[model samples]
Target: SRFLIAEYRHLIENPSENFKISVNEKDMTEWDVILRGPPDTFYEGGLFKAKIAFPPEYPYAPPRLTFTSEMWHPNIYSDGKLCISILIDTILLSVISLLNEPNPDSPANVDAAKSYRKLLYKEDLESYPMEVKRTVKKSLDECSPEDIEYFKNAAS
Candidate 1:
């Protein structure tokens, strides 16, 4: 069926180092994904597992992905469902940029983004390029710090 292939097509377009498609030699419909926890956060050391549910009329709609592993990130619900824009909206922003500014408007983990937002606005910065560099490299070396305090406080 085209459902599997269509679902597979969507995944490969935005494959992250953290999460990748798990397919077998037969090219089956079911898939397993191993998502690396974002580095420096509580989930950094973790490897979350996920399964995809493909729909028959797939290319026009999103695939269903639910975590098989327990997840506690602010964006992830207690139900092991992930919360991120990658699934809902599609934009031209680079993956690194998206991570730097996670969407809290419709967050999967409301509590996490809240704590994370507070820390960023409440804190003060002393240096420019250097301090910024230190913060980002700790994750993926991206320059955005808008979401740093959020993750820091959320993780704590």
Candidate 2:
């Protein structure tokens, strides 16, 4: 309970740099997470939404976080399940690592693992995510009416 509360409080206090954290109106236990990809990656500038489901038991049982948006990543699956260790074994590890490090185990998508490293925008000094950059621009241009409305008003 304490850990869960702390994480919630932390998120409320220091939201994601490229995302917004909005709690559901009626249920504080559930939250809405809108994330944009980090600086230069295949998902750069991509706007995505997520749903965080905190277990009633909370700290004893890690929360379940799923994406409501269409995303393809190794850690985050097509079905939206985030195959992360913090949520898998509460007693064995610390969730803090997830802040800066990504787990390679229990990948949600096999191809994403290899592709993510080679993604154009995330090519690092070797190169950049040019393809991803172009895609983001196109996506922004072709944003659906509803998406345009959502993004137009949200700080993210």
Candidate 3:
């Protein structure tokens, strides 16, 4: 409890540039997260909601993070789970970097992996980016008007 609370306080005091985080009022072990797309990327202007579940032995054990919003990426599973290893403290930053450069060698979604590889090799540049853009648009469209307004303002 002490460690988690301190960590959460530190995060709140020093918020990340690309994401917003809030702890669950009823459950300290659970956290709500909102991630913004990296600027100039296909996912730009996108808002992705996710949750973080910390284990009882936090700091020593890695917390689990799962996206609630739909995602289309090579490093993200179809069910919205991430494929990369968590570094505890660097989880969010790692996610941002992963969004920028997916690890094709360790793909969570094979179809996305193939598309990403094609995109990299310049064989089928349109497929991956198009799919990602479609997903981003869909995510925006799915948001309620009030939620959209809040997200936009918070992002800004």
- What's the distance in Å from true for residue 19, model 1? 3.5
Give one clash count per candidate, in the order shown.
3, 3, 0
- Over the stretch 1-156, how does candidate 2's per-residue lDDT look in tens digits? 566666668766763445556678888788766555554345556655667778788767767777676555556666767744544222112222232244666657565556556653565533224434553565556445665455436554
Off by over 4 Å in 2: 1-16, 86-104, 111-156
Cα lDDT tens digits for candidate 3, 37-60 = 888998887778888988888778
The CA lDDT at 47 in model 3 is: 74
Per-prediction TM-score: 0.49, 0.57, 0.84
Evaluated at residue 46, the lDDT of candidate 1 is 39
The residue-by-residue lDDT of candidate 1 on 1-156, one tens digit each, is 554556567767755444555564453545765444556543343344566555566566655666666543445565756533453212212222343455666567665555456556764332222332333344333213442332344444
* Candidate 3 ranges with C-alpha deviation above 4 Å: 25-27, 84-89, 144-156
Candidate closest to the true structure, highest lDDT:
3
Measured by TM-score, the strongest candidate is: 3
* Cα-based lDDT for every prediction: 0.47, 0.55, 0.78
